[PDB]
């Protein structure tokens, strides 16, 4: 069902419903301002739930003159990072 998904702008343009016939002649008396939240405000390219440290994206490529390799993250360490978000 990967092909069934859509774009972020398409989803918010439909959920907000700020372009229909309701908000034309005062038909919409909701009086509650629906707020749009940008879901990309907090992004760390490479970070994931499994906690994989990819050299180049999050961790620096070279460490003390030695190029780092692919490595995972400790369970306690990953929990703290998620708690930060």
């Amino acid at each position: 069902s990967f092909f069934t998904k859509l774009t972020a702008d398409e989803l918010w343009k439909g959920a907000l419903a700020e372009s229909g016939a309701g908000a034309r002649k005062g038909r919409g008396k909701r009086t509650k301002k629906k707020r749009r939240k940008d879901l990309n405000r907090g992004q760390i390219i490479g970070e994931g739930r499994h906690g994989f440290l990819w050299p180049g994206l999050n961790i620096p490529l070279m460490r003390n003159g030695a190029v780092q390799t692919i490595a995972q993250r400790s369970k306690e360490d990953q929990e703290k990072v998620e708690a930060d978000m």
């Binding site: 069902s1 990967f2 092909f3 998904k5 859509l6 774009t7 972020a8 989803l11 939240k37 879901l39 990309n40 992004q43 760390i44 390219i45 490479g46 970070e47 994931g48 739930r49 499994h50 994989f52 990819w54 994206l57 999050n58």
Partner: protein, 99 residues
């Protein structure tokens, strides 16, 4: 139609590989069944559907590894979080109406 024509027609059929002996109109179908590829074995039929299981699973695994970011799946999770906060979530097994 003469006996000379019958011999020539059969002799030509033998060389080119067609059926020599006379055959009924309905009896020619068995030749067609093996001459052509069956419908159920054509590549257009059994490979009609792209494997959505591989497509969905691969992108789901890449999502958790931080290499692919899907906006649409993030939208569902964000709205699902708000439903739990509002107090309207999905009950566990055996909790719908038996209580």
């Amino acid at each position: 139609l003469s006996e000379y024509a019958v011999r020539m027609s059969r002799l030509s059929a033998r060389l080119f590989g067609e059926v020599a002996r006379p055959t009924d109109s309905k009896s020619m179908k068995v030749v067609k069944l093996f001459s052509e590829q069956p419908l159920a074995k054509r590549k257009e039929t059994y490979d009609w559907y792209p494997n959505h299981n591989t497509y969905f699973a691969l992108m789901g695994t890449l999502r958790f590894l931080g290499l692919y970011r899907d906006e649409h799946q993030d939208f569902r999770d964000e709205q699902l979080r708000l439903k739990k906060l509002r107090g309207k979530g999905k009950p566990r097994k055996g909790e719908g109406k038996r209580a």
